[PDB]
Amino acid sequence: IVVLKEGTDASQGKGQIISNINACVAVQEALKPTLGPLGSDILIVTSNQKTTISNDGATILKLLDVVHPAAKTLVDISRAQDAEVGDGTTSVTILAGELMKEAKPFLEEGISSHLIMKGYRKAVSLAVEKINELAVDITSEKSSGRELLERCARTAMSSKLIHNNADFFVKMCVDAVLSLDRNDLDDKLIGIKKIPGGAMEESLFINGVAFKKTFSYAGFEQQPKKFNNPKILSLNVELELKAEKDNAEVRVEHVEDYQAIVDAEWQLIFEKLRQVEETGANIVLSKLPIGDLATQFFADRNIFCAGRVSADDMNRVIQAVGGSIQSTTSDIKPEHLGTCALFEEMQIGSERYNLFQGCPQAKTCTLLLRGGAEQVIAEVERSLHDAIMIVKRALQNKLIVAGGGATEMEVSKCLRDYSKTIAGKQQMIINAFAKALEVIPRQLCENAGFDAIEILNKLRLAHSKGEKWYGVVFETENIGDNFAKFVWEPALVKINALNSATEATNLILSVDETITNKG
Amino acid sequence: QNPNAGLFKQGYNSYSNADGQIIKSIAAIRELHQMCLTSMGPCGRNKIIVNHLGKIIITNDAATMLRELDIVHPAVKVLVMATEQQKIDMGDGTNLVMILAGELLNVSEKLISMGLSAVEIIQGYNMARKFTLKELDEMVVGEITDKNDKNELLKMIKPVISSKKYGSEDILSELVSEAVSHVLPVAQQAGEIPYFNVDSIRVVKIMGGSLSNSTVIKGMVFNREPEGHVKSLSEDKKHKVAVFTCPLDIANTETKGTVLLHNAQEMLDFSKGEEKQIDAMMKEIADMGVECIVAGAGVGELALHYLNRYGILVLKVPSKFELRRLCRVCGATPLPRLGAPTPEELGLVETVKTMEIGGDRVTVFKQEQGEISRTSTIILRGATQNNLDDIERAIDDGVAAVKGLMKPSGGKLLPGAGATEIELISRITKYGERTPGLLQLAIKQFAVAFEVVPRTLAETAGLDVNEVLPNLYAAHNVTEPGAVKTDHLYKGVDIDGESDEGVKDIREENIYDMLATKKFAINVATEAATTVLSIDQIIMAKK
């Protein structure tokens, strides 16, 4: 009748770690197909009834939100990779997963979880020393500031939808990053807009910012679309006379008074519109609608309006022109105004878009991507995103190591040789680590449709000849010098991704018991 | 058909010793024993706990394991309640009480099966306790001399950090020792003044990086930035600090004091009241020489305007508990009223500065070589939320253990890593052989229970206990030419991740346990096991 746990779940022992391993396998397998430039996509339907398709391990894991407590440890560590480093998210999940798979046969044979973790801690520490040793300090060596970044983006765009058009898209990626202050680069500084219709080769590059022109109200053939040096004012207040929700009941004894009240309401909004004119603004932008009367008033003043603009687009405009948003019209100051070098409205995609260009105060830029379908624009956007990342990292991280599995191959080799002098349980665990590292060149081959067995054999044998930059070639199925081919990753990504995968492996293998509090 | 008999209380599942309930109670405890058994030792195991709030905790802490379980059965409640006693009256010993109490019950299963009554078992255990406590007084080797130097604090802190965070001791030990030596004065030959308040060391955490970026602050850290224009104080000494709880705006009544405006003139006069009343209020604060104002509530636009004009540092502290602690350093008293800045309620601070930790701006209230705070802050860093929280617990153990170094006999040291328990097994057993009559049966088993410590230390490290244990006993099972056993009292249990024939010495790593912790924990464990063994019935009424 008396109980110990009142229905609270608790389980401990070797079987508990094996269960934790199985949970990690489910996570590893979920992301497995996304590895490599030819990786497959994952389709996730969220609880909010929104469907997404992506191969970005960071987006995938954040949407899956795997509940199993063991998975939460693995996923959270991969999340930290996304926050602390910005790349290697899939590598952390995959590397940790394979290690959990390797731990299983050792635990079953009665190998203590302490020695499994201890061998991993030593073997990984050795790997970090080797990855650091491989670091190449590269700046302008046999490559100009332009050639380095164009070669980086062009490489990223290989075997992509925009590979044959690299001559066009590479320029946008390199110009986009070089338009930024190298002292502080952030993905948020390069915006991308989607414009259905037309060919992808017709995309636009803007040194300032632009927005979709969400203002869809009346006002054809008015509000001048082009300004040389406009003053930009942003407001919160809605400038329409009548609301969609609010109103007033008017009841008086005279027809003159009935009209007087309607005119009074017109006068009240008129004074607010006049104050905007007194500001000396040329472009009037609002988070809320700017009404039919307001735009006719402003148009007769040769002032261009665009209302109902999203908070993100409004901020990017103000942040580009150097102005400020004011809630009211009576409190506006001249320091709220910004300026762009050019404002224009484009007819691209058979729809009107509002562009700013050459903004002298901007720290950002925008790409406007065109295409006949969401799948075309999305595929171009994803290819551009990866290209932007490698261009960004080319400026931020001078210490690089060969990619394509090349770094993993050298570490694995040095571990296989190191273990030759180790006796006891540590020998088996070090070798298991050396084997687990091969999951990367393996999955890179398999997801690409290559003969992974042949390529892995060629990589092992060719590497033993002293050429430490051999890796997976994705242009033609073979192996080659991925350093000379400009397929590289920052040394810090390899060190941090490995350390993160190691942490996730050790944290979960260290667990003997799970308790789930009920209530 | 089948009739019932023997149960006359109610429809129930009878729990009487007539059916071996004394064993069922122990068997029930075995479940929680096996849980905590995997925690103790530098190489202990982690446990995953899913909180009812959806928080996932992966920790070594045994108290968390027990506290987060909903427990009814009286047999385990005795041991869990005993554990909580260990948490309140001592800064350590959590695993020692739970594990030893279970093992004392485990060995009792043989004595009970032998036919030895619960009374006879308890009587022997009480005798063994009395022998054990006397031996602990005499097995002392080292002593902390209450000098509170860094080297002395580190000697104790190191083994305290171990068994929760192993391999991080080099960083964590420095974090605690620096915080303690800052707030813990050197004192001796006086017991009237208490030292080392539990609130003397605060721990805060910032996401990102790892423990290598941790540090120690000589004062209090607040998560808020200065809301005013002034972001820091000058280097001038003895800045006067005014502390308020009431929002800083137009003066009002402590209770309600809300002004309603209906007439045009009322709005005109009230608006003027705001500017005139706030200025005069801030004027008096400035005229007193106040350079920093600390509010438990918001500060209005005009209040910030005039506070800026007077050059007064404006810092909000939304936490009343943080203000209550600040009052212990700067001496200020918060004003619940608005417009009554009595000078008697002012405090002092030497420096208030805005600093960035990990990109997160915080405000520090600190001193350099004067009017020195008795409260310090330890800064923890980490990109992983779980490890960041778990390190905080490791620091808590470091701080809590130092509390045990105070006046009540915290000096005496015993060799750790199981060396104490191994010696106790030999000494308690010999007392058993000398003790006449049936008492020897339970006294000997009392000794047996203590092997769980050298056994757990080996097992958790991945060592074969069936080879380590006989070597541990052989090291202490020595005959010496004298009454006093010496020349090597340091033989402990290795926890190394690499093979090493034999055992290492305590003196090599300076792993010592506190006498007060060992005597108290064993005393508590004996009372816990004693109670459970005495139970021959569970009584309950239907709800």
Side-chain angles (χ1 to χ4, degrees):
Chain A
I1 304 302
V2 298
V3 297
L4 294 176
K5 295 187 287 292
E6 296 190 53
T8 302
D9 290 344
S11 175
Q12 72 177 127
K14 179 174 66 182
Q16 195 63 22
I17 295 169
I18 292 168
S19 295
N20 290 342
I21 290 168
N22 288 341
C24 294
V25 170
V27 175
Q28 182 187 7
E29 294 294 312
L31 272 65
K32 177 180 77 184
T34 63
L35 277 292
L38 279 67
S40 296
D41 290 318
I42 302 174
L43 192 157
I44 298 173
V45 183
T46 62
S47 66
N48 289 329
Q49 303 185 48
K50 180 179 178 180
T51 299
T52 64
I53 300 172
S54 181
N55 65 341
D56 180 355
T59 298
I60 293 303
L61 292 176
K62 291 169 193 175
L63 294 176
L64 290 174
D65 194 23
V66 178
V67 172
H68 193 292
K72 280 289 188 180
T73 299
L74 176 59
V75 171
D76 186 62
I77 295 298
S78 292
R79 180 188 65 79
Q81 185 73 15
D82 189 62
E84 297 284 301
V85 177
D87 204 345
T89 298
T90 56
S91 294
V92 171
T93 296
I94 295 301
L95 288 171
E98 194 70 14
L99 291 174
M100 298 298 282
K101 287 179 177 176
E102 287 293 307
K104 182 175 185 292
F106 291 124
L107 294 166
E108 292 175 331
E109 294 292 310
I111 305 300
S112 174
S113 67
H114 183 69
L115 272 298
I116 293 168
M117 290 187 283
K118 179 68 176 179
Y120 283 156
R121 287 174 181 172
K122 287 179 67 177
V124 168
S125 295
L126 293 169
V128 170
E129 290 178 354
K130 298 283 86 174
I131 294 167
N132 187 62
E133 184 176 359
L134 293 172
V136 178
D137 184 351
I138 182 166
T139 56
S140 60
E141 184 179 354
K142 301 182 182 178
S143 179
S144 68
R146 182 174 175 179
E147 290 169 323
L148 176 63
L149 275 57
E150 288 181 353
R151 289 169 179 168
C152 293
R154 185 178 296 274
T155 300
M157 294 180 188
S158 63
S159 300
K160 298 294 186 182
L161 185 62
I162 60 172
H163 181 167
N164 286 339
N165 293 312
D167 289 346
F168 174 73
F169 290 96
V170 166
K171 185 178 192 297
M172 290 193 293
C173 289
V174 174
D175 286 347
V177 173
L178 290 178
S179 73
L180 304 179
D181 183 350
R182 186 175 179 182
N183 288 282
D184 188 1
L185 299 180
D186 193 296
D187 294 347
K188 297 185 292 298
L189 301 173
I190 302 172
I192 299 177
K193 300 296 185 181
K194 300 180 179 177
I195 300 89
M200 69 178 72
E201 70 183 358
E202 298 180 87
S203 301
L204 280 70
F205 182 101
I206 304 180
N207 288 285
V209 299
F211 66 99
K212 291 181 178 179
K213 183 184 171 77
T214 57
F215 187 75
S216 62
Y217 296 70
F220 62 89
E221 295 186 356
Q222 62 172 45
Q223 297 178 80
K225 70 182 180 182
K226 182 181 288 185
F227 301 91
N228 289 341
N229 298 280
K231 296 294 184 182
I232 296 86
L233 172 71
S234 176
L235 301 171
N236 291 319
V237 66
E238 190 178 4
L239 296 179
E240 181 61 279
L241 177 60
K242 302 295 184 182
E244 293 180 356
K245 176 185 75 72
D246 293 346
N247 214 319
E249 185 178 359
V250 180
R251 182 173 64 87
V252 298
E253 294 178 358
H254 297 83
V255 302
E256 187 66 19
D257 288 345
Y258 274 112
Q259 189 64 50
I261 296 300
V262 170
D263 288 350
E265 291 177 330
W266 182 89
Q267 288 175 333
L268 288 172
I269 192 64
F270 181 89
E271 288 292 308
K272 289 179 180 178
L273 298 169
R274 186 173 68 82
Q275 289 177 332
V276 171
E277 179 179 358
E278 290 181 329
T279 299
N282 298 108
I283 299 170
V284 180
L285 180 147
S286 178
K287 289 176 68 177
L288 303 179
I290 301 171
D292 287 347
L293 184 274
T295 58
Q296 290 175 32
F297 171 94
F298 284 123
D300 284 349
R301 271 69 179 170
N302 296 310
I303 293 169
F304 178 93
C305 301
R308 187 170 67 193
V309 176
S310 69
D312 189 65
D313 286 344
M314 180 278 292
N315 284 338
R316 287 180 183 277
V317 168
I318 287 300
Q319 290 174 333
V321 302
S324 181
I325 184 165
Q326 178 66 28
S327 293
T328 65
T329 61
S330 293
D331 298 312
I332 297 170
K333 303 296 184 183
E335 294 179 357
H336 297 158
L337 298 172
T339 302
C340 65
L342 176 68
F343 180 80
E344 62 185 1
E345 185 172 286
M346 299 295 289
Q347 298 180 88
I348 58 170
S350 301
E351 180 61 279
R352 299 293 180 91
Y353 291 81
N354 287 139
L355 281 70
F356 300 84
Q357 181 65 282
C359 295
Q361 300 298 305
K363 302 296 183 182
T364 68
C365 65
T366 305
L367 304 178
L368 275 69
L369 306 180
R370 293 175 68 169
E374 178 66 20
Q375 295 82 41
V376 173
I377 294 169
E379 187 65 19
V380 171
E381 180 178 359
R382 291 167 190 166
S383 297
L384 288 170
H385 181 74
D386 288 346
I388 289 167
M389 289 174 69
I390 193 67
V391 169
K392 179 186 70 180
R393 290 173 288 176
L395 297 177
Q396 298 295 291
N397 295 291
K398 73 182 184 181
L399 300 178
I400 66 170
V401 295
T407 298
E408 289 79 2
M409 286 301 300
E410 177 67 16
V411 171
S412 183
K413 176 63 168 61
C414 294
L415 293 161
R416 289 181 186 279
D417 291 346
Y418 180 90
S419 72
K420 292 179 183 179
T421 60
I422 303 300
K425 287 178 173 68
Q426 296 79 6
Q427 183 187 61
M428 292 187 289
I429 302 302
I430 293 166
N431 286 339
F433 179 54
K435 181 176 179 180
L437 290 172
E438 293 186 355
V439 71
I440 295 301
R442 179 177 174 177
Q443 290 181 359
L444 289 175
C445 295
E446 292 176 358
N447 289 341
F450 298 158
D451 181 337
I453 294 167
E454 180 177 334
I455 295 299
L456 289 171
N457 284 336
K458 288 180 179 177
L459 287 172
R460 290 186 197 101
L461 297 175
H463 183 269
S464 72
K465 296 179 181 179
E467 294 185 85
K468 297 181 183 297
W469 293 328
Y470 270 122
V472 177
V473 175
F474 299 96
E475 291 167 353
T476 299
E477 180 178 353
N478 213 320
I479 66 168
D481 180 338
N482 272 337
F483 181 77
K485 294 179 75 69
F486 312 110
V487 181
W488 61 266
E489 297 177 84
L492 293 175
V493 170
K494 292 298 179 185
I495 293 169
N496 289 338
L498 181 59
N499 286 341
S500 293
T502 305
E503 178 178 336
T505 299
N506 288 341
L507 287 174
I508 299 172
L509 292 177
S510 71
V511 174
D512 189 64
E513 180 179 358
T514 303
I515 296 170
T516 301
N517 188 276
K518 302 292 179 67
Chain B
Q1 287 184 33
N2 188 58
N4 294 316
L7 173 61
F8 303 85
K9 291 190 287 291
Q10 65 188 340
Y12 204 75
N13 186 0
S14 177
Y15 297 121
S16 172
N17 194 39
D19 294 317
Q21 181 59 49
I22 194 168
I23 300 302
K24 292 179 184 181
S25 292
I26 296 169
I29 289 168
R30 282 183 171 275
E31 287 184 22
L32 295 178
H33 178 68
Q34 289 295 312
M35 294 180 186
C36 72
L37 191 59
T38 60
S39 174
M40 184 175 69
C43 299
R45 300 291 188 275
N46 280 312
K47 301 183 185 305
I48 296 172
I49 305 95
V50 183
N51 196 274
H52 65 281
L53 298 176
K55 182 180 175 68
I56 307 300
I57 303 94
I58 306 95
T59 186
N60 290 318
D61 188 70
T64 299
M65 180 274 289
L66 292 175
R67 286 173 172 170
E68 296 292 311
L69 292 170
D70 289 336
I71 302 170
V72 176
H73 195 302
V76 287
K77 290 291 286 185
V78 170
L79 273 64
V80 174
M81 290 164 63
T83 300
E84 288 298 346
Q85 181 182 326
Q86 192 67 25
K87 294 293 289 183
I88 296 168
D89 294 337
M90 190 65 65
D92 207 338
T94 302
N95 276 328
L96 292 176
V97 171
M98 190 69 188
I99 292 172
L100 181 58
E103 289 286 311
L104 290 170
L105 294 174
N106 288 343
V107 300
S108 296
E109 289 178 349
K110 182 172 181 176
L111 297 170
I112 294 164
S113 296
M114 189 181 293
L116 192 66
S117 67
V119 173
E120 289 164 308
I121 293 167
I122 289 168
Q123 288 172 170
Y125 285 159
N126 286 343
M127 289 297 292
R129 174 183 60 190
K130 290 178 181 178
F131 286 124
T132 301
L133 291 173
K134 289 179 181 179
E135 287 291 308
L136 288 166
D137 287 346
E138 295 185 0
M139 293 299 101
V140 173
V141 176
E143 182 172 331
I144 300 297
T145 59
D146 298 347
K147 296 295 183 178
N148 298 334
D149 199 353
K150 180 169 180 169
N151 287 339
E152 186 168 64
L153 291 170
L154 288 170
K155 185 174 182 176
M156 180 57 75
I157 290 165
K158 176 180 180 183
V160 172
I161 296 300
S162 72
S163 87
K164 296 295 183 67
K165 296 293 290 183
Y166 180 77
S168 297
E169 291 175 18
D170 288 346
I171 300 301
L172 296 175
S173 297
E174 289 288 306
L175 291 173
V176 175
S177 182
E178 286 287 313
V180 170
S181 66
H182 186 68
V183 302
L184 178 62
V186 178
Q188 63 181 59
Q189 299 177 252
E192 295 179 356
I193 300 170
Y195 298 111
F196 198 76
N197 195 279
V198 297
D199 293 336
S200 66
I201 299 174
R202 184 182 188 190
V203 183
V204 301
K205 65 184 181 181
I206 299 293
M207 288 299 295
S210 190
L211 76 169
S212 67
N213 292 326
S214 60
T215 189
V216 178
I217 305 298
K218 293 184 180 181
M220 292 179 69
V221 178
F222 297 80
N223 287 339
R224 296 291 294 169
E225 296 182 55
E227 291 183 355
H229 186 69
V230 177
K231 304 305 182 187
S232 67
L233 301 176
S234 77
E235 295 179 358
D236 289 291
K237 296 181 180 179
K238 300 186 184 296
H239 292 292
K240 290 181 182 179
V241 180
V243 180
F244 298 80
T245 301
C246 184
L248 299 180
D249 210 295
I250 189 171
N252 60 39
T253 302
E254 187 173 354
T255 299
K256 295 182 181 179
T258 299
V259 176
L260 303 179
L261 308 172
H262 301 290
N263 196 271
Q265 193 65 51
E266 290 172 339
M267 290 188 286
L268 292 172
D269 293 351
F270 184 80
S271 297
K272 290 178 182 178
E274 290 178 331
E275 291 178 356
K276 290 180 179 180
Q277 291 179 30
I278 293 171
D279 186 0
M281 180 181 72
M282 297 309 181
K283 181 180 184 294
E284 181 174 359
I285 292 167
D287 285 346
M288 291 189 291
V290 175
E291 298 291 314
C292 180
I293 187 165
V294 180
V299 184
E301 290 177 354
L302 288 172
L304 289 173
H305 182 74
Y306 291 112
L307 286 164
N308 290 340
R309 285 181 180 271
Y310 291 115
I312 300 168
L313 179 64
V314 184
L315 188 278
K316 181 181 177 182
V317 181
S319 169
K320 289 180 180 178
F321 285 97
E322 289 177 350
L323 286 173
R324 287 175 180 171
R325 290 174 177 167
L326 186 60
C327 300
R328 299 174 184 174
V329 176
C330 65
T333 299
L335 183 68
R337 296 179 178 178
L338 183 65
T342 304
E344 294 179 357
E345 297 178 359
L346 299 176
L348 295 173
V349 67
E350 292 296 289
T351 300
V352 181
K353 182 175 180 180
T354 302
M355 63 186 182
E356 290 179 356
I357 300 171
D360 288 344
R361 288 174 178 173
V362 300
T363 302
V364 59
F365 288 70
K366 63 179 182 179
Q367 302 85 40
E368 181 68 45
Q369 300 178 39
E371 300 290 340
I372 297 171
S373 174
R374 299 295 300 279
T375 299
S376 67
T377 306
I378 294 170
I379 307 302
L380 302 177
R381 301 298 309 282
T384 298
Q385 290 177 332
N386 184 74
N387 287 340
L388 184 55
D389 288 347
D390 193 65
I391 292 167
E392 185 176 302
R393 296 287 81 76
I395 297 298
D396 287 343
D397 288 347
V399 174
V402 167
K403 185 180 176 184
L405 290 172
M406 299 297 107
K407 177 168 66 172
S409 299
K412 306 291 179 180
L413 301 176
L414 298 87
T420 295
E421 284 80 5
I422 294 164
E423 182 64 20
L424 290 175
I425 291 166
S426 295
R427 294 293 291 164
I428 294 165
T429 300
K430 287 180 179 179
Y431 282 121
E433 289 181 351
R434 291 174 181 174
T435 301
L438 272 55
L439 292 173
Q440 72 180 282
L441 291 170
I443 292 168
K444 289 177 184 179
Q445 290 305 311
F446 193 83
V448 170
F450 280 65
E451 79 185 358
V452 68
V453 171
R455 183 179 178 87
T456 301
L457 291 171
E459 183 177 0
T460 55
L463 304 175
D464 186 344
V465 297
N466 288 335
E467 295 184 355
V468 174
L469 286 171
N471 287 336
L472 291 168
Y473 292 120
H476 288 261
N477 190 39
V478 299
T479 299
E480 297 178 23
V484 177
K485 189 177 185 176
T486 186
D487 295 319
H488 72 274
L489 300 177
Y490 302 114
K491 299 293 178 186
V493 183
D494 293 349
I495 52 74
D496 289 349
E498 297 180 356
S499 296
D500 190 358
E501 184 177 1
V503 300
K504 290 183 173 66
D505 299 350
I506 292 301
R507 61 190 164 175
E508 289 170 325
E509 294 293 326
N510 293 307
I511 302 302
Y512 290 89
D513 293 317
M514 185 179 292
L515 179 66
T517 299
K518 291 291 182 180
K519 288 176 72 175
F520 187 56
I522 290 166
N523 185 62
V524 172
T526 301
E527 286 287 307
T530 293
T531 297
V532 171
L533 292 171
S534 66
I535 307 311
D536 66 355
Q537 185 173 71
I538 300 170
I539 294 171
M540 178 182 287
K542 182 180 183 293
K543 296 175 76 169

